[model samples]
Every structure is written in C-alpha cells, then in structure tokens.
Target chain A: MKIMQVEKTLVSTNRIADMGHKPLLVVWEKPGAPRQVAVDAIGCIPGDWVLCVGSSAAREAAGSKSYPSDLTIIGIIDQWN
Target chain B: MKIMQVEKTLVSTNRIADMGHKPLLVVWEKPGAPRQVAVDAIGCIPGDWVLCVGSSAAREAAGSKSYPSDLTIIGIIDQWN
Candidate 1:
C-alpha cells in the first residue's frame, strides 16, 4: 500500500455499473506528486491521509469479487509519525 | 485514476494463475516519466492515453477481486487537455 492524501470527491455522471455505489475520491501521493481518483471504501474526508491499495485487491476493498475499481482507500492514517 | 500513456505490451509466460488471461501493458505517466506494468482491462494499445488505477482496486479492473494486480488501465482517453 502507498500513502496518499484525500484531495476531493470525484463525481462521474457516466461510469460502469459494476462498481455499485461506492464514492470516488481524488487522492494525491504528496503535496505536488501525481494525483489519481480512487474508490473510498472507508469514509474519508479531504486532507485525510490514507493507505491506498492497488491491484485486484482493490476489488475486495470495495466489497466485490469483480468490480471496475483500480485504486481504493483501504485505511485512514491517523498518525504517520 | 491517473492519465498515462501505453508504452508497450508486456509478455510474461509465467505469472500468477488468479489473473487468468488478462493482458499486461507497460505504461508511463508521460514521455519521460517513470514506467510501470499494468493490466490492460480495457484493451488499450501502444501510444494510447489511458486512465490508470493503482492499488488492490486494480485487481477489480482485471475482472478479478483477488488477482495479484497492482496497476490497471481502466479507460482509453480519446481527448484530454
């Protein structure tokens, strides 16, 4: 897993239905690093640090055996000191 | 997800079985950015700009919930600014 910060929520009017109703989020690797959108399996807010999981395991994080998800927020990092 | 360019196809005769027959691709954030291998869930071609997802969620992009995939191509970008 990688450390990322929640940037914002992503709203997609059109998307695959396989993902169900999971909320999509914009996350960043750091302050100015690359950013990506991910499925928020757990409730996370902007500025929250999270543990991001990549790969097929991401599907499991969304509570599905097969879903169209590639990035997922698996955990909220309360302390990273 | 992040925007990346498909660099080429990756061939690995030996791989984990849970992934089934998903195609593997080499992708980069840009022309001179770091590259990584990802599952081609959307049948992307070289030179194609694609939306890449990373983490356990990438497994779902490969059509499996528990596949050993860390990166996946979820969409083909026809236009982007």
Candidate 2:
C-alpha cells in the first residue's frame, strides 16, 4: 500500500459500468506528482492522508473481486509527518 | 487493461523480492505523460503499444499470484493508432 493525500473527489457520470458506484477521489503521492484517481470505500476528506492499495488488494478493498479498480483508498492515516 | 507505449527498459538491480527477475519497462500513456514502470513478461521493444494489466491481473500476468507487480505488460497491440 502507498500513502497518498486526498486531493478532491472526482465525479464521472459516464464510466465503465464495471466500476459500480464507488466514489472516486483525486490523489497524489506528493506535491509536483502527477495526480491519479482512486476508488474510496472508507470515507475521506480532502487533505486527509489515506492508505491506498493496488492490484488484487485493491479489488478486495473496493468490496469485490469483480471491481475493475486498480487503486482504492482503504484507510485514513492519523499521523505521518 | 490500458494501452500504453513502451518507452524504454527500466533497470533496477535492487527491488523487493516479490518482484523476482522480470524485466522492467518504462511506459507512458502518451507523449508528455508521466512515465511509470511495468513488469514485462512478454518480449516488448521500445515503441511497441502494449496492453498493461494492473492489480491482481498484473500479478497473474507477471506469472504468479505472489508477484508484487502492480503493472504488467500482457500483450502487444498490433494496431492502435
């Protein structure tokens, strides 16, 4: 898992139906890093540091074995400074 | 899976053991896009448009469920212009 900061929520009305209805969030590894998207199952606010899982781990975290998600937010980090 | 062009081979002598000995390649979604690393199981040359799998799919494509790969080149596109 990687620790990325939640930048904001991403709203996409038209996407693969395989994505289901999971909330998408904009996340970044750090400043100057290219932004990427992640599915959020655990609620997180902007600026919150989150634990993101990838691969099969992400599928499980997204709540399914069928979720096409490659990235998913699974936890909120209280302190990592 | 995502279609990305292989830019070059990434040589990393030191990495997690879960990575094994698979060749690493630098790939990008397109020109001007940030490049990322992907495990290469199939032979791919620079400039080949490759099909990349991520998450559990990546691990599976990399040849094992224990592979710690997040991205893996599974196929080479014949035509994708």
Which candidate number maximizes lDDT? 1
**DockQ of candidate 1 against the true complex:** 0.27
- For all the candidates, what are their Cα RMSDs to the real structure? 4.9, 8.5
TM-scores, all candidates, are 0.58, 0.55
DockQ score for candidate 2: 0.09
Overlapping backbone residue pairs in candidate 2 total 3
The stretch of ten residues in a row with the least summed lDDT in candidate 2 chain B is: B72-81
Cα error, candidate 1, residue B38 (Å): 0.7
Give the poorly placed runs of model 2, Cα more than 4 Å off: B1-30, B34-53, B57-81
- Summarize candidate 1's per-residue lDDT along B1-81 as a digit string, tens digits: 776889899999988678788899999988888889988877777998776766655666667667888777776665532
